[PDB]
Each structure stands twice: as C-alpha cells, then as structure tokens.
C-alpha cells in the first residue's frame, strides 16, 4: 500500500526506493451535482457520505 | 528590521517568506532544509560479547589426595574426584590402584575478539536537533549548519538568523537502546549484575576495557569416565549467539515519519515532524527604496491551466501597466497555492507568467507583484498518473473556495430554502398580528 | 526469601531492618549510607577565555598609495590614511612631503594560556545518583558502591541487593551552568554567535581546540598623530576579566539541603533528600532455626532514665525468663525511638540493658527480643545543652502518646464534658417522651 504519505522498500542490496501517491480519482468535478459527489468520494470515501 | 516566521520541517520544501517594510519595496526570502539530524544523549550501561571457556589441564595426584581452593574468577567451578585410574598411550600411571585423585577446574572469560564484535546497551534521552539550511535571497546564496534550538545565531551576509526550538518533542528512541554495528534496537535489557544464562546479557562488562566481569552461564562439571583423562563439563550456550539469531526487526526498518537511523554516533536523520520557528534581523542594504522599484497599477491575474498534481502543474499570467522596467518580488499570501519563483522581471510589455502548485479542486489566493495585489481563482482537473516518485510540492490543503462550483451549488440551495423559511415566518407573523389586533 | 524496605537518604543514619521468616528466628540488618553523589548530564556549549589583540607593524608607503584588503579574521579591522609624514630617530623618511599613506591593521585572537584558564558553559539535565552503602548483619561487614536506580544488583555475602530509584526528582543545578575551576554558577549566558562586548562571552569558541572563533569587542582604529608611527586603536576591555570580579555568589555556598558542590566531574555530594527503596534476597544460611534460638517468656520493659536529646539519651531494661543462653535480635517497631544496638546477649540471669534515642516528650513503642514482645512507655525530660556539633539520631517525631500526661488531661476533660452532654440529652429525651405520651 502507498498512501499519500508514500512508502519505501528495500530489495536485496539495492538502495531503498520511495514512491508517493497523487490525489487521483474517477469522478468529475465542475460537473453535475451527482458528479461532484463522485469526485470527492474517490478521495476520502468516508467523510463525503457523512457530509452528504 | 526584526522579523519572525514559522517554517515546516520538511526536507526539500521551498519555503518563501514575504517581508514588507513600510518604507521599502517588499522582499522575498527562500529557505530550505537540506538535511536534518536528531541526536540523543547516551549513557553506556554495559557491553556484551561471546564468552570463552578456559579449561586448564587436570591435576591427577598419584597415591594421595588433593583439596579444592576457592578463587575470585568469573563463574569459577572446581571439584575433586576420588578413585580415578587414568591411562595413557603406553601405559597407565598412578600405580596405586584406587587411592588416586583428579582435580577438575574451569572458569569463563571474555572472548579474544570482544573488542571488535560487541553490542552496547545504552539509555537514550533528551534528543537534540541539528539542521543544514540553505538560505538564498537577492544576490545571496549560501548553506549554513545550524543548531535548531533558540540559542545559536548565525550570520548570513549581514543578516542574523536564530532557528527556534522544534514545535514537537517526539523522538523515536525508547528509554533503553541496544546498538550493534549499524543497527539500533528498541529493547529492554537485564540490569547489570542480574543477567540470566542463555539469553542476552549472560556475561556483562561495564566497559570494553574494564577489568571486572559478571558471568552467569551455569557451568557445571561432571565425573570423568573410567580410564580416561578429559575433564568433562556442560554449559548453556552463548547468549550473544542466541540473540543474534532471534533479535527480530530493527529500528532502521521500523521508525515512523520515514527517518533513517544511522550509527556512530546514534542519530535519526531527515525525520519530518513539527515546525521550526525562525527569527531574523536584516540590515538596511537588503531592501530597495520604493522610489527606485517600478510602480505597478491595474493588476489582473488570469489562470491559463490548472491540474492539482504534485509538481508545479498550474500556469498563471499577470497583466499590468508599468512606468519603468525593473524587478519585483512575487508572493502568494495563502498556502493553498505555492509559486515556483520569488522574483520576476517586469517590462513595459505588461505580461509575466508564473507557475504554481496546488492540491485543491478550486483554489483562491491573492498574489502580489511588488506592491500591487490581485485575486486569482481557477478550476483544476485531477491528474491521471496514479503514482510518482517525488514528494508533494504543495501544502496539501483540499477545502475549496466558497466561489467554487460545489460551494456555489450549496449556497444556491441554502438560499432557496432560507427564502422559503423567511416567507413562512412572515406569513405567520402577519397572521398572528392580525389575530391579536382583534 | 524476598524482602523490601524503604530507608532514609541521610548520611550516617543507622537504618535497621527487621526480617521475620516464619520458620526461623528474626534477623536484624544495619544499612548506612556512607556517601552519595548526584551526577548531572552535561553538554558543552562554548568556551570563553581572555582575548589578545594582535597589531602588526604599520606599512608606510612612500610617494604612493595603498588599498584596503579584506580578510577572514575574527573582528578584523583595516583602514588607509592619507597625508602621513612619519619620523624616526635618524630623520624623517618618505621624501614626499604629503603624498604618503599608512595602512593600519588589527584583529583579535584567543589568548596563549586559554588552555589552562577558561570558563565552560554547559547545559545540565537528568541527574544520576550514585551511592556507597555499608551493609552489616550477622557477622558480615563490607561497603559497596551502588548506582541508586532500579537496575543495579550487587551481592554482599550471598545476598542480592537492589537499591530502588530515589523518591524525589530534585536537582540543585539549573538548566544552564557556568563552571570555573572548582566553582559552579547558576547563570544564563548569551547564545553562541550573539555575545555582547564587555561582558561574559564577548569571544566564544566551540571547544578548546576548535579553530573557529567568534569575537565582538568593538575594536576601532584611529588616525595616527602627526609625525608618529604608532597605529592607535581602542577596544572595550575583556568581558571574561570583568566577569571574574563581578560574577557574584556561587553554588558551593548557595546550594540547598547542605550538599557540597565539586568539579571534575560536576557533582553534588551528601545531599539529604528523599527515600531509597531497597529490595533484598537472602539465602537460608543467614537465618537460624527457631529450635536453636533461645525461648523467651514473660517479657517486661522498664525505663530508668530518659532525656529527648540528639545522642542516645535513654536507658532501657528488660526482664525475662530463658531456658538457654545465646543471642537474640533487638528491634523497635515504631520510629518514635531508635535503638542503638541490633543484637543482645540473653543470659539465665534474666536482665539485659539497651540504649534508645527519642525526640518526643512521652514515647510509646513496642520492643521485641527474639520472638517476645513488650510495650514500653516513659516520661522524658528535655536536655540542657543548646547546641551540639553532631546530627540527630532520632526520626524527629514529637507527638506524644495518648496515655501521656497532656493527653491524659485532655482525655479527662473531654470525658467530663461528654458526661455532662449525655446527661443533658437523657433529661431532654425523658421529658420529650413524657410529653408525647400525654
Ligand atoms: C611408589 O609406590 C608405592 C605403592 O605402594 C607408594 O606407596 C604409597 O605411598 C603413599 C604416600 O602418601 C601412601 O598413601 C598414604 O596411605 C595411607 C593409608 O591409606 C593414608 O592414611 C595416607 O593419608 C596416605 O594417603 C600409600 O598408601 C602407599 N601405598 C601403599 C602403602 O600401598 C609410593 O608413594 C610410591 N612412590 C612414589 C610415587 O614416589
Ligand atoms: C545556490 O547555490 C547552490 C550551491 O551553493 C546551487 O546548487 C547547485 O545546484 C545545481 C542543481 O540544483 C547543481 O547542478 C548539478 O550538478 C550535477 C553535477 O553532477 C549535475 O549532475 C546535475 O544535473 C546539476 O546540473 C550545482 O552543482 C549546485 N552548485 C554547487 C554545488 O555549487 C544553487 O543552484 C544556487 N541557486 C541557484 C538559484 O542557482
Ligand atoms: C625619489 O623622490 C622623488 C621625489 O619627487 C619621487 O618622485 C615622485 O614619484 C611619484 C611616483 O611616480 C610621483 O607621484 C605621481 O604624481 C603624479 C602627479 O604629478 C600622479 O599623476 C601619479 O599617479 C603619481 O602619484 C611624484 O609626483 C614624484 N614627485 C614629484 C615631485 O613629482 C620618486 O618616486 C622617488 N624615487 C624613489 C625610487 O623613491
Ligand atoms: C566494619 O568496618 C568498619 C571499618 O573497618 C568498622 O568501623 C571501624 O570501627 C573501629 C572500631 O570498632 C574503628 O577503630 C577505632 O575508631 C575510633 C574512632 O574514634 C578511633 O579513635 C580509634 O583509634 C580506632 O581507630 C575504625 O576507625 C572504624 N572505621 C571506620 C572507617 O569508621 C566497623 O566497626 C566494622 N563493623 C563491625 C561490626 O565491627
């Protein structure tokens, strides 16, 4: 798992490598209100439901 | 000109400060934390290493008796056996058939290579932070090594800098620490003088050169077999060798906040947490008189493209009318967006471009070029790439502006409902006043 | 047989612990704290010593001019003067009358004897207590050196001793310390890189051998007098030498709880505060079986003379009946009175004598000889000497027993008042009952 904080992994003798994620999703912001909720649901899929 | 600020303790984050003196044109500094180092304070408890058992040759007394003598040696064991009849290759000596005696002796001592291969048991407390900050502004560009506590002032090009104490007091080392070569272990070791056989700390020494030694390995002697000379014994195997095979994990692969643990000295590096207050004291030669810098009027900020990604994925444009061409110091007064540059060349053409990185769907920030001001607002689309190998260049703020599409919809719906409720209130008030007037 | 106790942290106080194994005769130990040492943890900040101004010879240029050159020296100063016409014993050189220049130069440097006479500025935190205890019981003497924290076990004649952490966490050293030879001061010194001229810390060095130096002593050059070669200059006097005569007080003559401060290493010794928990583990050979111990019956305790003074100002007499003659252990089960001796010789004559020290007007305590018991009460008169040169040998308990003279008077008076109140309430209740039955 690679959260937005990122992570590092050590493989054999190689140097550790760090990988970071981006705030990417599947909805459409600046669309119909049934698409803005979709956008803010890929991000934080636990507080959007409560707020709605 | 005294100034104060607070800058994040994140390696590589391009912090820029805006200093706006009342009599001079504004200035923009750039500070960056190239490297950080967290140093604990250590008190050595003892040293452990593999033991080595010393077995002197037996003393077989022919036709007689021998007596054991006590000695002051670590884990000394001595016993006397009767009725022995040894043998050798050519014949059996001790002519007396059964009135013989063998004295078995053994004791333990620190190994030969304990000075090269040993583990130290420390107590770690009261960490001290130390950094290496790169400070650049105007025509100044230098890197300095600073102690991050409010008592080390370093002068960079005539300016005094005091980096205040770290905001938080979090350190990754427990009270007790066991160090081996280049690995640090969060472990609880037995007290000196009470180590148990077979586990870590079966033999303990206060220091690698210290003459005293506490050893407890359960060394026990046994009666030799008939017709042989061998001094048998049994002993619980080494504790340092059990420990090496069963220490488990480390701290190099377990520390929070992604900070590397290094040894000699013990130190945790690049460990992102907290904020670093900064105090300054600038001379009067850094600024420029407001008369000399250009005058900027009618500033409009328009956003070309936006994409809330990690790198600088937004392009900004400024239109203005200026009298003379020179230099300004751009800055963004909200942490929603972070510009890339701290200086722009203004020209009579009246058009400059800037790059910014943001992490919210609809940002709103106020940007200033020399003394002017402007409010920028834009709509940004998410990026497609799932994973990238560089850290975020924004402050990671997500709440959109009240003028964004989502919040515009919320405002409109709430306004409609509020108008309905106000109309109902008015109807009720009119009805009740008419009823009471009767 | 595991055991635990709590002993005062006062030097020389003869603590006696009483151990009562059910299958064996009681045992009495004696533990005395010969010496303590409160050892802080120190981090060096910088080193200050008197400075020494270096003035190279002037370079008088004849019929020409010279330019100033900048250099990286501590508090460096350089200037060029115009129109000098110097003179020497034989005459006046620089043939040109007016077109000559003289170049003045000076800078500061650390003194020659700075390695032998300097003041160190430290940070002190997290003191560590180390003690030297004398343990005597049965027939075993001996004095050991024990770290007073819950993880150092030392064995004295087969008995394992662990001296627990100190009750209090009080230290006489503030956060910041200045150490000079054999004197410690509680002082707040300027941060490195920001020392002010003329006071402590005008010049600072990170270590005795460190090459870097920071100097701020207001060195300022002046124009040479006409017809002279001297390089005049002015400079604010040394701040270290000023500090020497106006440091004020110390900590050796200022510390609380009467503990002497020493140096190399910095430590505060014999400093009476708190309590020291003690854990034990005794072998079976330390005790004597109850069958071997003499049997004591009908124990009665009488006090001949008493005087609540610092030394042992009481004499105690015990009468009993025994079957055999041997050794008993004597202990007092209350801290109001402390017995001088821990064992006594029981004889068929049926009389032993003891010495005790008390600090209350009327003490009451129970004393045991081997397994017997007896309750002792006495009336003690105050002493006559106003001042003595030795410490107190009692536990400083003043409240008398409820059976004392003063408490007897209080009890009698309160009993009379209670009888009166009870009679009143009885009369009122009788009258109320008669009235209600009407
Ligand atoms: C040469 O061989 C003879 C073998 O008989 C050795 O004679 C032995 O000498 C030892 C001297 O200590 C005798 O030991 C003693 O035995 C008595 C009785 O058991 C005991 O009470 C003493 O405390 C002591 O242990 C031993 O008995 C004796 N052997 C006999 C008499 O048969 C002789 O010592 C040898 N000479 C050498 C090795 O130079
Ligand atoms: C302010 O001064 C620092 C140095 O005091 C400048 O750091 C410079 O950083 C660049 C890249 O960030 C370095 O160039 C690199 O050189 C390596 C050599 O192998 C090359 O592989 C890289 O691709 C890159 O070209 C440069 O060496 C370094 N200068 C030094 C160390 O003296 C910094 O750039 C200065 N600020 C500005 C705005 O220029
Ligand atoms: C011997 O003594 C004579 C005495 O005059 C020295 O002559 C002087 O030389 C200096 C250096 O060349 C002259 O200074 C120059 O002045 C002109 C202005 O006239 C200026 O433009 C130059 O830049 C330079 O500063 C100086 O004028 C001249 N004396 C006179 C009266 O003109 C000579 O240098 C001495 N020689 C030695 C080897 O000491
Ligand atoms: C356990 O060991 C200590 C130290 O060896 C014993 O303390 C010592 O006690 C003897 C007397 O029993 C002291 O000798 C005399 O001391 C007086 C003191 O005024 C002096 O005037 C005499 O000239 C003579 O030296 C000795 O000084 C003393 N040592 C110390 C360091 O205090 C202790 O008595 C031993 N335990 C037992 C049960 O004996």
Specify the residue with its C-alpha closest to ligand 1, atom 20: B64
Distance CA(C5)–CA(C163), nearest Å, equals: 10
Instruction: With beta carbons less than 8 A apart as the criterion, state whether B363 and B355 touch.
Output: no
Sign of the Cα torsion B334, B339, B341, B344 reads: negative
Distance CA(B173)–CA(B371), nearest Å, equals: 49
Count Cα atoms within 13 angstroms, Cβ side, for C432. Answer: 6
User: CA–CA distance from B249 to each of B186, B187, C62 (Å)?
Assistant: 10, 11, 77
Is B34 touching ligand 2 by the criterion CB < 6 Å? no
User: CA–CA distance from C315 to each of B66, C337, C339, C378 (Å)?
Assistant: 55, 12, 10, 10
Phi, psi dihedrals of residue C331, rounded to the nearest 5°: -145, 150
Q: Tokens 């209090």, residue? A: C168
Q: How far is the CA of B141 from the centre of ligand 2 (A)?
A: 11
State the pairing for strand pair C275-281/C159-163: antiparallel
Enumerate the residues of chain B whose CB falls inside 8 A of the CB of residue A31. Answer: 405
Taking the CA of residue B270 and the nearest CA in chain A, the distance in Å comes to 14
Q: Cβ of A22 and B386 within 8 Å?
A: yes
Count Cα atoms within 13 angstroms, Cβ side, for B208. Answer: 11
Count the neighbouring beta carbons within 10 Å of the beta carbon of residue B24: 18
Q: Under DSSP, is residue C68 helix (H, G, I), strand (E, B) or coil? A: coil
For B435, the token pair is: 């009823």
CA neighbor of B1 nearest in space, from B31, B33, B23: B23
Distance CA(C48)–CA(C242), nearest Å, equals: 12
Check residue C284 and report its DSSP letter.
G
Q: Cβ of C153 and B192 within 8 Å?
A: yes
Instruction: With beta carbons less than 8 A apart as the criterion, state whether C391 and C310 touch.
Output: yes
Specify the residue with its C-alpha closest to ligand 1, atom 36: B63
Q: Under DSSP, is residue B89 helix (H, G, I), strand (E, B) or coil? A: coil
For C425, the token pair is: 């309430």
Mutational test site, ligand 3, from C62, C63, C94, max ligand atoms within 8 Å of CB:
C63
Instruction: With beta carbons less than 8 A apart as the criterion, state whether C358 and C398 touch.
Output: no
Q: Tokens 């005091």, residue? A: B162
Q: Is B397 exposed, middle or buried (0-12, 13-18, 19+ CB in 10 A)?
A: middle
Mutational test site, ligand 4, from C141, C340, C341, C390, max ligand atoms within 8 Å of CB:
C141
Taking the CA of residue C154 and the nearest CA in chain B, the distance in Å comes to 7
CA neighbor of C107 nearest in space, from C242, C231, C224: C231
Q: Tokens 């900070």, residue? A: B259
Interface test with A, best of B383, B406, B412, B413 (most A CBs within 10 A): B406
Per 3-state DSSP, what percentage of chain B is helix, strand, and coil (rounded to 5)? Answer: 10, 40, 50
Locate all alpha helices (DSSP H) within C184-317, ordered by sequence.
239-245
List b or e across B189-205, with b for residues whose CB sees 16 or more CB atoms inside 10 angstroms: bbbbbbbebbebbbbbb
**DSSP secondary structure, C156-222, as one string:** ETTEEEEEPPPS----S--SEEEEETTEEEE--PPPBT-PPTTSTTSEEBSSSS-S--EE----EE-
Strands across the sheet containing B159-163: B2-8, B275-281, B159-163, B153-156
Q: Cβ of A23 and B391 within 8 Å?
A: no
Q: Cβ of B43 and C128 within 8 Å?
A: yes
Residues near C91 by Cβ (< 8 Å), separated by ≥ 6? none
User: CA–CA distance from C381 to each of B260, C309, C398 (Å)?
Assistant: 73, 9, 13
Q: Under DSSP, is residue C370 helix (H, G, I), strand (E, B) or coil? A: coil
Distance CA(C201)–CA(C195), nearest Å, equals: 5
C239: left (phi over 0), alpha (psi -120 to 50) or beta: alpha
User: CA–CA distance from B416 to each of B403, B412, C342 (Å)?
Assistant: 17, 6, 94
Which amino acids bring their CB within 6 angstroms of ligand 1?
Answer: B 62-64, 95-96, 99
Work out the angle between the directed axes of helices A33-42 and B405-437 (0-180°, nearest 10). 120
Residues 375-434 on B with a CB inside 8 Å of A are: 379, 381-392, 396, 398, 405-406, 409
CA neighbor of C227 nearest in space, from C55, C89, C349: C89
Q: How far is the CA of B64 from the centre of ligand 1 (A)?
A: 7
Instruction: With beta carbons less than 8 A apart as the criterion, state whether B133 and B87 touch.
Output: no
Strands across the sheet containing C159-163: C2-8, C275-281, C159-163, C153-156
Count the neighbouring beta carbons within 10 Å of the beta carbon of residue B308: 24
Q: Under DSSP, is residue C77 helix (H, G, I), strand (E, B) or coil? A: strand
Nearest ligand atom owner, CA of C101? 3
Distance CA(C196)–CA(C203), nearest Å, equals: 9
Taking the CA of residue A10 and the nearest CA in chain B, the distance in Å comes to 9
Mutational test site, ligand 1, from B65, B95, B96, max ligand atoms within 8 Å of CB:
B96
User: CA–CA distance from C109 to each of B380, C53, C58, C295, C299 (Å)?
Assistant: 61, 6, 19, 84, 83
Q: Tokens 């001290």, residue? A: B128
Enumerate the residues of chain C whose CB falls inside 8 A of the CB of residue B43. Answer: 41, 128
Residues near C207 by Cβ (< 8 Å), separated by ≥ 6? C44, C47
Question: What are residue B15's DSSP bridge partners?
Answer: B31
Is B136 touching ligand 2 by the criterion CB < 6 Å? yes
C and A: touch, per 3+ CB pairs < 8 A?
Answer: no
For B257, the token pair is: 């906040």
Q: Does B351 touch chain C (CB under 8 A)?
A: no
CA neighbor of B273 nearest in space, from B131, B126, B122: B131
Q: Under DSSP, is residue B39 helix (H, G, I), strand (E, B) or coil? A: strand
Distance CA(B319)–CA(B299), nearest Å, equals: 6
CA neighbor of C341 nearest in space, from C53, C30, C1: C30
Chain B residue with the nearest C-alpha to that of A34: B406
Residues near B69 by Cβ (< 8 Å), separated by ≥ 6? B78
Instruction: With beta carbons less than 8 A apart as the criterion, state whether C129 and C236 touch.
Output: no
Q: How far is the CA of B344 from the centre of ligand 2 (A)?
A: 21
Chain B residue with the nearest C-alpha to that of A28: B381
Distance CA(C58)–CA(C62), nearest Å, equals: 12
Enumerate the residues of chain B whose CB falls inside 8 A of the CB of residue A19. Answer: 387-389
Instruction: List the single residue in A10, A20, A30 with the smallest CB-CB distance to B390.
Output: A20
Taking the CA of residue A36 and the nearest CA in chain B, the distance in Å comes to 7
Report residue C36 CA to chain centroid gap: 8
Check residue B57 and report its DSSP letter.
P
Instruction: With beta carbons less than 8 A apart as the criterion, state whether C160 and C152 touch.
Output: no
User: CA–CA distance from C44 to each of A7, B140, C178, C181 (Å)?
Assistant: 38, 32, 10, 15
Cis peptide before B265 (omega within 30 of 0): yes
Question: What are residue C279's DSSP bridge partners?
Answer: C4, C162
Count the neighbouring beta carbons within 10 Å of the beta carbon of residue B435: 8
User: CA–CA distance from C268 to each of A46, C131, C391 (Å)?
Assistant: 59, 12, 20
Report residue B144 CA to chain centroid gap: 20
Q: Cβ of C153 and B193 within 8 Å?
A: yes
Enumerate the residues of chain C whose CB falls inside 8 A of the CB of residue B155. Answer: 193
Taking the CA of residue C192 and the nearest CA in chain B, the distance in Å comes to 5
Is C429 touching ligand 3 by the criterion CB < 6 Å? no
Q: What is the CA radius of gyration of chain C?
A: 39
Any idea how long chain C is? 438
Cis peptide before C265 (omega within 30 of 0): yes
Residues near B323 by Cβ (< 8 Å), separated by ≥ 6? B294, B295
Q: Under DSSP, is residue C417 helix (H, G, I), strand (E, B) or coil? A: helix
Nearest ligand atom owner, CA of B135? 2
For B188, the token pair is: 């609880």
For C152, the token pair is: 């150092």
Instruction: With beta carbons less than 8 A apart as the criterion, state whether C307 and C356 touch.
Output: no
Q: Under DSSP, is residue C413 helix (H, G, I), strand (E, B) or coil? A: helix
Q: Cβ of B194 and C128 within 8 Å?
A: no
Distance CA(C64)–CA(B117), nearest Å, equals: 70
User: CA–CA distance from B336 to each of B215, B299, B401 (Å)?
Assistant: 63, 20, 10
Q: Is B367 exposed, middle or buried (0-12, 13-18, 19+ CB in 10 A)?
A: buried
Interface test with A, best of B11, B361, B394, B398 (most A CBs within 10 A): B361
Enumerate the residues of chain A whose CB falls inside 8 A of the CB of residue B405. Answer: 29-31, 36
Taking the CA of residue B203 and the nearest CA in chain C, the distance in Å comes to 14
H or E element in which residue B130 lies = strand B119-137
């Amino acid at each position: 798992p690679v959260p937005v904080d990122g992570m590092e992994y050590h493989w054999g003798n190689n140097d550790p490598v760090r990988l970071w994620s981006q705030l990417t999703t599947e909805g459409k912001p600046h669309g119909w209100p049934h698409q803005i909720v979709q956008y803010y649901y890929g991000l934080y899929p636990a507080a959007t439901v409560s707020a709605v | 000109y005294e100034h104060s600020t607070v800058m994040p303790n994140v390696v590589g984050f391009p912090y820029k400060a805006h200093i706006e003196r009342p009599g001079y044109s504004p200035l923009t500094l750039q500070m960056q934390v190239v490297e950080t180092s967290l140093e604990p304070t250590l008190n050595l408890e003892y040293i452990t290493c593999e033991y080595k058992t010393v077995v002197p040759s037996p003393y077989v007394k022919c036709c007689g008796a021998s007596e054991c003598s006590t000695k002051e040696k670590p884990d000394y064991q001595c016993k006397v056996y009767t009725g022995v009849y040894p043998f050798m290759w050519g014949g059996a000596y001790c002519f007396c058939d059964s009135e013989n005696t063998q004295l078995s002796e053994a004791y333990v001592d620190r190994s030969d290579v304990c000075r090269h291969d040993h583990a130290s048991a420390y107590k770690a407390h009261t960490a001290s932070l130390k950094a290496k900050v790169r400070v650049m502004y105007g025509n100044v560009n230098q890197t300095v090594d600073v102690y991050v506590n409010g008592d080390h002032a370093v002068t960079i090009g005539g300016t005094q800098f005091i980096f205040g104490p770290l905001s938080s007091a979090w350190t990754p080392f427990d009270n007790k620490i066991v160090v081996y070569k280049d690995e640090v272990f969060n472990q609880d070791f037995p007290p000196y003088g009470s180590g148990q056989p077979g586990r870590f700390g079966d033999i303990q020494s206060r220091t690698v050169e210290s003459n005293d030694l506490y050893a407890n390995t359960a060394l026990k002697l046994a009666r030799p077999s008939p017709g042989m000379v061998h001094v048998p014994y049994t002993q619980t195997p080494s504790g340092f060798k059990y420990w090496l095979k069963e220490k488990g994990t480390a701290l190099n692969t377990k520390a929070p906040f992604g900070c590397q643990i290094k040894t000699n000295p013990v130190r945790a590096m690049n460990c992102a947490v907290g904020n670093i207050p900064v105090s300054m004291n600038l001379p009067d030669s850094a600024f420029t008189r407001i008369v000399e810098a250009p005058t900027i009027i009618d500033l409009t900020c328009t956003v070309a493209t936006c994409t809330h990604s990690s790198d600088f994925g937004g392009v900004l444009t400024l239109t203005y009318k200026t009298d003379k061409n020179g230099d300004c110091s751009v800055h963004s007064h909200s942490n929603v967006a972070t510009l890339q540059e701290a200086t722009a060349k203004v020209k009579t053409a009246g058009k400059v471009t800037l790059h910014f990185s943001t992490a919210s769907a609809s940002p709103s920030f106020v940007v200033s070029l020399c003394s002017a001001r402007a409010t920028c607002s834009a709509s940004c689309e998410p990026p497609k790439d799932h994973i990238v190998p560089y850290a975020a260049s924004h402050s990671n703020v997500v709440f959109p502006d009240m003028s964004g599409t989502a919040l515009s919809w919320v405002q409109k719906i709430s306004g409609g409902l509020g108008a309905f409720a106000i109309g109902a209130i008015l109807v009720l008030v009119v009805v009740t006043c008419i009823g009471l007037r009767r």
